[PDB]
């Protein structure tokens, strides 16, 4: 399907909830209107001054379950916190970010629902439960928050750090553009009849960064707000 122009744009958790609570048609994801912040991100061998903004949110597959007629059960399933399993498996270089980057979420009216030390850390699995009743086949998904980054000057040394990236020259400096993803403490359960094939990390990066963002003009479906550098409230 691709064609990410089909997805709407939402600002903050109330708007994302509005999108997900509209059961009139199956939902896969949305572009996110969020603020840009500036601060350190460790990539490869050092910290780089990085611009970060939220850009997309999507539902990533957890599991499918079929329950017979007259059966009520407490279903246990694994959700994750911190960076997504797909993001973690896709990165080639040493990668880490301090907890204070979360000002990007606060300023964008998004909350991860996880602790300060958990939200931007390594992938950590946890058990979640829902009492469910049959008959039916149901698919469980977890909300993924996607961010675009410009790690300034990182492009000469880290051009192969990520599965998908773009470098851009600024005078004699080389910037590194890439996406990252973390989870939110939010999961959706839908009958197999109200379900479509969910988006995955490879598809999201190809469409959002490679096809829909142009570092050359800082345009496409989103733009970074460079004024973050000059705003103390958006520096972490």
Applying CB under 5 A, the residues found at the interface with Zn ion are: 33, 231, 233
Q: Which does 30 bind (CB under 5 to 8 A by kind): Hg ion, Zn ion, none?
A: Hg ion
User: How far apart are alpha carbons 109 and 219 in whole angstroms?
Assistant: 23
* Cα-based distances in Å from 80 to 130, 169, 229: 16, 36, 32
Strand partners, 65: 138
Q: Which does 233 bind (CB under 5 to 8 A by kind): Hg ion, Zn ion, none?
A: Zn ion
Nearer to Hg ion, 29 or 82 (CB): 29
Q: Which does 33 bind (CB under 5 to 8 A by kind): Hg ion, Zn ion, none?
A: Zn ion
Terminal alpha carbon distance of the chain: 38
User: How far apart are alpha carbons 109 and 13 in whole angstroms?
Assistant: 6
Nearer to Hg ion, 145 or 204 (CB): 145
- The conformational region for residue 117 under phi > 0 = left, psi -120 to 50 = alpha, else beta, is alpha
- Nearest distance from residue 157's CB to Hg ion, in Å? 27
Q: Which does 173 bind (CB under 5 to 8 A by kind): Zn ion, Hg ion, none?
A: none
Binding site for Hg ion (CB under 5 A): 29-30, 32, 54, 57, 145
Nearer to Hg ion, 140 or 145 (CB): 145
Nearer to Hg ion, 54 or 155 (CB): 54
Helix locations, 125-200, DSSP H: none
């Amino acid at each position: 399907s691709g064609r990410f122009d089909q997805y709407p744009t939402k600002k903050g958790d109330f708007a994302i909830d509005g999108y997900l609570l509209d059961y009139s048609s199956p939902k896969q994801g949305c572009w996110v209107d969020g603020i840009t912040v500036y601060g350190d991100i460790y990539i490869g061998k050092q910290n780089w001054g990085t611009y970060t903004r939220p850009v997309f949110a999507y539902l990533q597959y957890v599991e499918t379950i079929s329950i017979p007629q007259n059966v009520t059960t407490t279903l246990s399933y694994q959700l994750t916190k911190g960076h997504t399993r797909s993001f973690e498996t896709s990165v080639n270089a040493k990668y880490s970010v301090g907890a204070n980057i979360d000002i990007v979420n606060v300023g964008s009216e998004i909350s991860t629902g996880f602790t300060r030390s958990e939200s931007w850390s390594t992938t950590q699995s946890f058990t979640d439960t829902t009492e469910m009743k049959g008959p039916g086949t149901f698919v469980i998904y977890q909300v993924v928050l996607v961010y675009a980054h410009n790690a300034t000057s990182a492009g000469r040394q880290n051009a192969n750090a990520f599965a998908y990236s773009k470098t851009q020259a600024v005078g004699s400096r080389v910037d590194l553009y890439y996406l990252s993803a973390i989870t939110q403490r939010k999961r959706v359960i839908v009958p197999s009849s109200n379900a479509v094939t969910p988006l995955d990390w490879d598809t999201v990066q190809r469409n959002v960064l490679m096809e829909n963002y142009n570092p050359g003009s800082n345009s496409g479906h989103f733009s970074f707000d460079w004024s973050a550098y000059n705003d103390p409230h958006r520096r972490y």
